[PDB]
Structures are given as C-alpha cells and as structure tokens.
Design brief:
It is classed as dna replication. The structure is a homotrimer. Chain A has eight helices and 23 strands. In chain A, the strands form six sheets. A four-stranded antiparallel beta sheet of chain A has the order 1-2-3-4, with no helix packed on it. The first copy, chain A, folds into two domains: 296 residues, no CATH class; 123 residues, no CATH class. Chain A is an alpha+beta fold. In chain A, strand 17 and strand 18 form a beta hairpin. The interface between A and B is large, with 39 and 37 residues.
Chain lengths: 419, 431, 425
C-alpha cells in the first residue's frame, strides 16, 4: 500500500502543469510547474482582510495547510516544512523533519499555537507557531490531518490497524484511534485515486468546532457528542449525490460534483465542479452553498411520486427530514453552548427558532398519522413534542380527527409536563 | 466480500424450496418458494399463548426478527420492511429504508419499543415500534443485529475495520466497535468439498445466532459452535468475553469420547445456565423441515483435556464420559464463579426480573463453595498447604470456612487450621 | 499467517544446538539439544540473591518466563506448563492446557499471584501461583506477554483485529484495568536473519515494564517505545525514546553499519540494558558477553544536518542543536517520574533527587535554546521558550540573557511572567 501526501481539498496535476495544494473557507493554494521549479500562489476569498501573494518553490512542496493566521508548506520526500505567517510582522521559519528510509510526510496542519506533522511510519511531531519542538509521538500511520485553534483531528490507516481517527485538544485525547465509519472507494478520474487512494476529499472542524469529514461517497459525516466518550456518534448529514439528483430533476448526471470547503452551522461551503473531472480546475468557480439534509429520502418512492412530471418531495417525507435535522442541530448547538458558550451572538435565538421548527415538523407527522387513523403512532409522536404550545396545537388537530381518547391522553401528557 | 442478509438462527435454501427466516425461544419463521412469490409461516412454541399464522409474500423477504410482541420482515434489496404485531388489535406498518446504489439491508431487529435496521454501508437506522424515525447513525458495515428492550448488540465487519461489535442502550454506548474474539469460518479445500458449503455462502461470518440472554447479557454463537458471553459489560474497563459452552466438546463427552459428525447444535437462546437449542441430526448442520422438538444444553466451562478425560474414564470403568469429582470441581468452581458474578451484577443494577433471582443466586453461591471445598480437600489430601489456604480465601460463606477447618483437621494440618480461623476472625471483625 | 511461541528476548536455534528461551533484567534461560531431550539452564545476573540451576527437559519447552519469584515453562504443542518457584520451599506444579487441533500456546507470563497463558485461538487462561484455575477468557489472539509485580502488559494480533495491546493490574487487594485491546502503534516487519523471522514473525524482540513501572516494547524497527500517562485513559501516549539504529549510526561516525545490533533486556530510568551483538546474526549467541548500556535519545536529529555540522566542526553535535533533544528528553522523563512519584511513591530512595536534577537539565536545555532565539533577534520565539521554564531562577537567568542580547521588549515581558507567578503563589 502506498501512502500519498494529503492536504485538505487538494487536487491532482492530471494532464495539466498546475493543481490546488489545499482549499477551505479561508482561501486556496495553487502550484504551477515551472521547469525545474514550481510557482506557488496563495489566494484568499476575503480580499479585504488578506492580500494574495506569490513565490517560487525550489523544493517542490506537495503538502499544504491554510488558516486565518498563516500558511504551512511541506515536502513529503525531503521532509522539509515551512510556515509562512500572513502578517509579515511575524517572520517565516523553515524546518527539516527527520525521515527514515521510505518514510514520507503524509499530512500537515497548523493552528495559531501549533504546527503538526504526520508520517507514513506513524510518527506524530508537534511544534509551536514559532517552530519549537514540543512532542514526538508514535501513532498508527497518519493519512489525514486537520486542526482548529486547540483541537486536532487526525485520521489513521494501516493494514495492521485498520481505519481509525483521533481527536485531541490542549494534551488530551477525547478519541484515541477509534474506528472511523467512513466509506472507502471501489475512468477519467483514475488520476485522482492514484493521488488520493483513501478518497478523503476533505476534513475539517465546523464553525462550531465539531469534526467533519467528506469522503469518496460524497457524504458529509459529523461527529456528535464528541465531548462524551460513551455518547459519541457519527452522523451522515449530507448526501451530496442525492441532493444533486433532486436538483437535476431525477437524472443520473456525471458532470456535476461537489468539492467540500467547510461547514457553516447548517450550510456546506463547497465548489460545484462541472465536467468529467470530479476535482476543480483553473480557473476556480465561485463558491456555492449547500444546505444539509438527513438521508431519509427514498429514491424509489421519489420515482413513484414524480412520474407525472426539481423533484417534488412529499410532506411526510419532508417533515421527517426537518424533524430529524432540527433534532440533530439542537443537540449539537446546546452542547456547544453549555461547554464553549455563545460564539457568534445569535445562538440563543438560533436554538430557539430551531426548537420551533422541530415542533412544526412533528405536528405535520402527527397530522398525517391522525389522517391515517393511526391512534398509537400519533400518541407516540405527541410525547416527542417540546413546547407546551405545540401540545396545545396537537389537541386541535386531534379534535378535528374524531379521536377523543387521543385528546384525553395528550391532555394527560400536559398534566405530567405541568409538574 | 459479499454482505449477506442476516437473521438469528436463519437457514439457507440449499437445493430445497424452503428455509427458516429466523428462530429463537419464541418460535420460528419459515418461507417457501411459491412460483414468483413466497409462503411465509410464523410458528410458536407456546401454542396456548400465540396463534400460528400464514400469509403470501409478494416482495421476497429475506430478513426477519421475532419477539414476543411481533414479527419484523425485511427485503435486503429494496429496503422494504414490515412490522406485524401478533395481536391484530395493533395495525401492521410497512416502511421503505433509503438505500444507495449497491447498499443492502444486512440485519434487522425489534423490541417492544424499538425497530432497528443495519446496512452494508454501515447505516444504522432506529425507529419506535410504530415506525417513527429517531436516529440515523454511520457505523462500520453491519453484519448482524440483535436487540432486547432498549439494548442493542451489533456486529461489524469490513476489510478496513476488521471484526468488531458494539453494545448500546437507548443514547449510550457501553462498547463502540471493540474487537470481537469470535472465530471466522475456514473455507479451505475440505469445506469446499463439504455438504454445508451452502450455509457459509449464506452466512459468511458463520454467526449461527446472537442474542441477549434472559438476564440481559450479550451472547453470540459462531462457526466453532462455542457460546460466547460478554461479562461485566456495564463496566467498560472490566468487560471480558467468556466461552461458556463448547458444544463440540460437550457432545463429544455425551457420545462417550468419540468424534461424531452427525450431531449439530442450533442455538435459540440462553436461559440463565441452559442453552435452548435444536439438535440437528444428519449431514447438514442447519435444521430442516419438519423441525424437531427444542432441546436443552447446560453450559460448561472448557477446562478439560480430551486425553486426560479418556484415561480417567477408563480407570473408573475398570474399577457419557465419567469425570472424577476433584477434576469436575474445577469446571464447577469456574462456572459458578462466572454465573455468580453475572447474576450479582444483574441484581444490583436491574433488580429481580422474574422474582426468584435471589434464591437462584443463593443456590449458586452454595454450589460455588461446595466446588471450592472439593478442590480444598484434594489440596489437603496432597499435603499442599499453600494451595489449600489459597482456595480457602475464595470461599464466600463463613460456614464454608468452618467446613474447611474440619477438612484441615481430618487431614491433620494444624497450621492450616489456625490460618483459616484467622480468616473467619478477620471477616467477622470487618462487619 | 502463522502464530509462533513468543518469549521476551528469546533466540532461535539457527544452525546451533542451543538457544535462549528468554532474557530479561533478572537473568536468562537457555536450552541445549541433548540427544532426544534438552538441558535447561536458568541463570541470574545477581548471583548473590538467586541460585543458578539446571534440569533435563523431556517435553521440549519452547516457552519461558522468568521473574524474581520463579520460572514458568511451556510447551506450545502439547499445552504442558510448569511453574518452578525459585525458593524450593514452594513445590513445582505442572498443568496441561486444553488445546484444540492446531491451537498453540503463543505466550506465557507470571505474577506473584497469577500464571497466565495465551493461545493462538484467542483463549486466555489464568491460574494462581499454585495451579488453581481462576479464569477462562476469549480475547484477540495474544502474541506477547510481560509482567512486573502485579501489572500485566499483553500484545494482541489477528488479521481481523489488527495490532493491539492491553494493560491491567490485578494485585493482592485491588483490581484495575488500564487498557483493553487499544491499538498498538508498533511497526511490523516487511538473508542471514531468515531463521529469526520464521522464529518471530511479529518481530517483537522484547517487551517489558521499565524499572519505574512503565510499559516498553522493542520491535523490528529497533526503536524503544514507552507508554506515557498510562494511568490516565485520555492522556495516554506512546513515545519513541530510542532509535537504536540512529544512535549506532552516530557512534560509528555516521557510517551505515550492518554488523552491530541491539538486543533489549530492560529499561533503567534513562538507560537501556542490552546486549551488543556483533556479526551477521542480530540475536545473541552462546556464550553471552557482558550486558551493555545505551542511554536513551529522542529521534529529533536529521542525518544530513548532523553530517554537515560534524564536517564544519562519534558524531559531534552543536550545543544549540543538541539542546532540543535534551529539552524533550528531560521533559518526557520528568513527566513520567512525576507521575510515578505521585501515584506509587518513592521506590528506590533517590527519586526526589533524580527528579530535581532532571528539572535542572530541563531548564538548562531551554535556556540554551532561548539564547539561540535571542541570537537571531527572534523575540516571539524566545518569549515562547520562556513560558516553558519551571524554576523562577531560570526565568531570572532568561532576563539576564535577554539584557545581554539588547532585547528590551523581551526583558519587559519576561518580567511580567515573574511578576504574575509571584502573586499566584
């Protein structure tokens, strides 16, 4: 098995002389073949805060990581890394990572306080933002790295360890090489899978500090309850293939692809790649937005319904999605608030609006249940309502449906909830 | 590797037109090929309590789970499931599970409060008993599922994840994809010429069945025909898998020390210390129509050496395999030790469930002390003082310590008597 | 994949008639082909405390474990084990481990209260020191075992489970299970040494607890791994603390030798007790030379850079470059010793002084690094190094170095650290 140098949202050269070293919400880094050298260009999306620049690479950096404070570069074969702070007030530094025969740097990342290097032999080397060595650990061979502030999210693979992930903050490991439930891959894109065998398109922390990964199955995975070792769970919160299928009107397209950049609360910042290649090429299009959706849609049922004719989605199928999505986001946001506090200023209102949408979707499900003479299923749905005003609304729907026992029982719920 | 639809104690079609979808202590579900459709029959062992029924299957359900409240059916390719309550007062419901290209349902299970679906892509979908979605999780590819009340026991396999299991209660995960110490089948040249090859094509993992015991402890039964039980699962750091029944070994002892290849065990459930099963006779290891009457196999710890058992059962006969009391006591001590720990944990956490647990536990701890005393007597009979004293420290009841003293006196070991009395004095004082 | 009987620092027969069953800090056990039987010799390094003895082996023991209380022997095919207490007051006992067809005993170990057996089918069988069966468990196949006092360090492997380890402490009056089959970040192997890799497929040369009770392993990559913070489940980490290949390369003057090899016996604080094997074989042979010593070194050096520096100037290492290794090594050892003291207390009588001297070497290395930072007018990098200083007198010296380097802002900021720490007392 060959360990290849990984960087978030990086693209292959292909048949061109240029490619993207890395991409995210901050910007993107490109390198161009220039004879015996390379031409690196660091670009940003917010031109008001940052100033795009260029320089010549004499080493051939194939590793890169970009944040709001600086840019980190690495050469997987020689072991040379270089950190370049955005503000020239702070000076650049270059270091050489010790490598045994056959050992390659597989992934690098950087925070305002840490610089991290992982190798194919499972060496984990950390530094501060100035290049001072702080630790040298032995882990399962690292294949992917991301970091946000003090949190570090690593992915490991070996034929003797399997596919795992680790999550650490400043040292403390919430997760130590726990199994990672990401799907692995099974053509014009042959160049990509030689470039990224794992098929990890990108990985990152969300805007609220939750670990996310986006693999070859084009599904956004989010780790919930990562603060609770026994309550942790990976959530599929966006099947990008399905949503595109619904956008395109139910046709099997092979010209639209998603390239993940970041997750902002409920919206995936991405690049819509159009063509035969699944990876974006120069020039880079304008960043798009894709709202997350729980994988509760059935393609077959969607085909049955949409025979007469965007794909139209049934109220109950849509109510289930909105119910689950609100439930998921509510738990995450509540955890973030109770542990890390308000971060952007509107969380209490966002959470409030969230619990409202949670109840509306449930009532839609409650109505269909009553509309199907299903008494027991309706009562079960009633118990899942949060606000007392929602239980009140449930009674009104229950009265119109000629279900007296339901009305009593829902009122009995109000009796218990009063206490 | 092909992910195949799994169901507890399910059997393959083979070259016949009928098979069992699933089996347990409640009953068994069979399906028969009927032209372009299937004929499903749900049968029960307690004919007084439940009503056997039939219906025609137009979808081709290859997944099934059976409990005391209802029956769950699943179609691995279309993603269609159907829950059928035993009492017609409660209505049936059918749902279609979202499936990606190539994704198959690999296992389903149901409790009075939960309905669970697992797929080959590692999607884990849970519902209430009425079909209301509660959660959608991503895990390692699921190959087997079982559930009891709010607890869920899943088995996972991938060539990139290995063989693992999870234990959860609804949310909380006592165990998250921890290694599962279960043997996998060995499909070599002899197995490819074997008559039971159809079973391992139908169930690659060789998991014959898995279930929670009557006291709520996770059990699994694989191709090595050994019942495995997860002890101390409530304490994440103290958990351990216990081989509590080598069915190959026990049949070997029943048969008088001979290697039979015509008797096979088909696991249904575990009730305290007794494995509810079907004794299959023939060349096939899976039960066939008509289904024989359920048997009962008592659990035994695998601590015996086949050669040693032969020597002893030869000496006894010239003076089933007969086992010397002192030798058998080692197995009896360990089995009682194991069952006592399990039951004590069950009581302290979940209380009496059937009403007699405290009496069962009392009788259990009694057999525990008796076996220890037999080992203690053998130690004393060999002038092994240190070994005898070590056994004494493992005694539970104070009256057992007293009996140990008499054995020490009859064996004329006075120093032993003093130390054993100091144990009683020390334990008396600690109260 | 073939499971093979493992014992710590055990060697293969090769083309000779003798080999070592196991070697550790206590002594070594050897077996010699004696016609149709074997001649086992149990030897000790402390000839004053223990008594070397011999006996004839009619069973063909290929498994062995030696501690301060007794010697454990095992036959992987018949399943026969025998525990031999060093003090003849306690009688020997022999047991036969139940084995299915093809099942082999893969590893054994012993504590003062337990005798442990692991098999290739993943069976785990324990006994007390007198032969009373205590447990029969099913685990991931155990391939290596070591023990110190009441602590047990196991290694597991299967093609369906991967490479893992477990750490437990079952004492006289307390149970504690620190690690249960967590992933083990050890490297696996990929000729004259062919006899050894058929003898030890995993390539685990040896594994053991350090003299202070920390788990160590030494694999085919000849790098000593040490488990730090193993008492804290969320803080645990494996540390590469000795690349023996790298250190030999530095001893030999930067040349790639293929005739000098390390055979690990134990870890004493900061020193690896080992046998320096010279020749084509990587394993020691009879008769055994005198044990050597190898001081641990953090793998933070680049071969190319070391050569350039030693040409511009054994390999000579610049003070500013060597300080990084010394800083990290002291940092690592300090954390370990601090953990050991707070939990298990003083063990040998000099620990409080060792720790003090350790924190002193820690501060010196930082100050030398701090000087280099000042020497490059790098204020922020220098200030960051200052925050890592322990002693207030070290902060005082840092000010002095900051003054001499004409970095006034640095002097001001470092004083604020001293000021803040003064009130926070």
């Amino acid at each position: 098995f060959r360990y290849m140098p990984f960087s978030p949202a990086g693209t292959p050269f292909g048949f061109t002389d240029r490619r993207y070293l890395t991409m995210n919400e901050v910007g993107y880094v490109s390198t161009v073949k220039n004879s015996e050298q390379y031409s690196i260009t660091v670009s940003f999306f917010d031109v008001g805060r940052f100033r795009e620049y260029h320089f010549e690479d004499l080493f051939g950096y194939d590793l890169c990581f970009l944040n709001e404070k600086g840019t980190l570069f690495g050469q997987s074969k020689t072991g040379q890394i270089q950190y370049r702070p955005h503000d020239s007030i702070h000076s650049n530094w270059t270091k050489i990572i010790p490598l045994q025969a056959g050992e390659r740097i597989t992934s690098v990342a950087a925070t305002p306080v840490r610089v991290i290097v992982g190798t194919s032999l499972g060496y984990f080397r950390s530094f501060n933002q100035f290049g001072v060595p702080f630790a040298v650990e032995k882990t399962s061979p690292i294949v992917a790295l991301t970091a946000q502030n003090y949190r570090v999210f690593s992915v490991h693979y070996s034929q003797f360890h399997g596919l795992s992930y680790s999550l650490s903050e400043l040292k403390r490991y919430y997760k130590r090489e726990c199994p990672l439930p990401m799907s692995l891959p099974n053509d014009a894109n042959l160049d990509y899978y030689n470039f990224n065998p794992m098929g990890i398109k990108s990985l990152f922390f969300s805007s609220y500090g939750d670990p996310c990964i986006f693999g070859s199955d084009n599904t956004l995975l989010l780790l919930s309850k990562w603060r609770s070792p026994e309550e942790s769970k990976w959530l599929p919160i966006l099947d990008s293939n399905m949503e595109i299928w619904k956008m395109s009107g139910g046709k099997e397209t092979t010209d639209i692809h998603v390239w993940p950049l970041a997750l902002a609360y409920d919206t995936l910042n991405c690049i819509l790649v159009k063509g035969k290649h699944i990876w974006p090429e120069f020039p880079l299009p304008l960043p798009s937005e894709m709202e997350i959706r729980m994988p509760v849609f059935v393609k077959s049922k969607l085909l049955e319904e949409n025979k007469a004719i965007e794909i139209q989605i049934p109220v109950s199928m849509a109510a289930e999605e909105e119910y689950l999505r609100s439930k998921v986001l509510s738990e995450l946001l509540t955890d973030t608030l109770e542990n890390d506090g308000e971060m952007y200023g509107n969380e209490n209102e966002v959470l409030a609006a969230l619990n409202g949408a949670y109840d509306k979707a449930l009532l839609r499900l409650f109505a269909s249940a009553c509309s199907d003479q299903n008494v027991e299923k309706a009562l079960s749905l009633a118990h899942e309502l949060k606000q007392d005003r929602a239980l009140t609304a449930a009674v009104k729907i229950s009265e119109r449906a000629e279900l007296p026992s339901l009305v009593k029982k829902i009122n009995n719920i109000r009796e218990a909830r009063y206490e």
